[model samples]
Target: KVFGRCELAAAMKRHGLDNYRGYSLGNWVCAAKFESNFNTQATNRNTDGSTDYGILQINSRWWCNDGRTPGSRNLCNIPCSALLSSDITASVNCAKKIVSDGNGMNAWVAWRNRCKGTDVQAWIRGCRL
Candidate 1:
């Protein structure tokens, strides 16, 4: 499912993305915007044989085990396929673990470039939490 701004906002907000840590809801919104354009089915295969899955692009190497990526950790203990589901619960949970795992929000390029260490008030505008 490709969620609209408000829908994605509600989805993430409802699932606890809002201030999951110190990062606000808009920070995650910006990450989703650049990471997958709010498409729940988005997948990106990296050059290193690791694949990123779902909106937040949870990686197979560390988060979900797709039975392909080398050094698959499956730390989230979920199949990578679950990340693509429109339900979004698994994805959001994994994201929480990812943030809580000491990497912080630097886990994604979108967050590093667009959400973290920057102002996400721009994306925060339209989606009135």
Candidate 2:
């Protein structure tokens, strides 16, 4: 499933991402676009054999367990497949945990590259949220 920008913004606000970890909802939305283009089932394989999952492209090596990464911390304690569900509740929860780990939003390379210091308001311009 793919989420439109406004749809993603509203969903994220309900999931406590509006001002999470000092990052605005636009920051999250903007990074999601760069990371996975808002696709709920998106996945990317890394050279180290770790995989990124869902809209956030969370890494399997440290967050979710995909059973493919040779070493995994799975700190979110969820199966990586859970990140692909259309409901997106698990994915939202996991993202909070990712930021709660003290990495802030910088944990995502997309955030560092695309969202950081950028005019993120465009990500949710018409959401009125």
Candidate 3:
């Protein structure tokens, strides 16, 4: 399991990813709840033996050998896990690379736009960066 948001924030600050430690837990909880309900070791199988793994449900195929650190990817599974486990600021920044493309949490924006009926981003009440 990851160390939780306070620890994640400190790590991010140390890593120079951000000075903002504001929204880590909200994002973490929201993503997990929406996706996998906080099960860190969760997985979904293919018809074969292959599977997606962990909380964000990263596919093993997508994550294979894509080591951000020397050998850490295998240990963490996806770079998301590394980001989640090591530093949420960096993790969120990296996630924004895909989810927002440096546009500042497009998932959050889209969540606001599309999910208002479900109030999904309601979890983001104070999660602003």
Residue 125 in candidate 2, Cα distance off native in Å: 0.7
lDDT of 1 by residue, 1-129 (tens): 999877898888899889897888888888999999999999999999999999899999989989998876899999999999999999999999999988789978778876676778667677666
RMSD of each: 1.2, 0.9, 7.8
lDDT per residue for candidate 3 within 54-88, as digits (tens), equals 44444433342333323223322344344334223
lDDT of 2 by residue, 38-85 (tens): 999999999999999999999999999888898678989999999999
In model 2, the runs with Cα more than 4 Å from the true position are: none
Q: Find the 10 residues in a row with the least total lDDT in model 2.
A: 120-129
Candidate order (lDDT): 2, 1, 3
What's the C-alpha lDDT at position 12 in model 2? 94
The number of the candidate with the highest lDDT is 2
lDDT of 2 at 59: 93
**Candidate 1, residue 122: how far the Cα is off, in Å:** 2.3
Candidate 2's TM-score reads 0.96
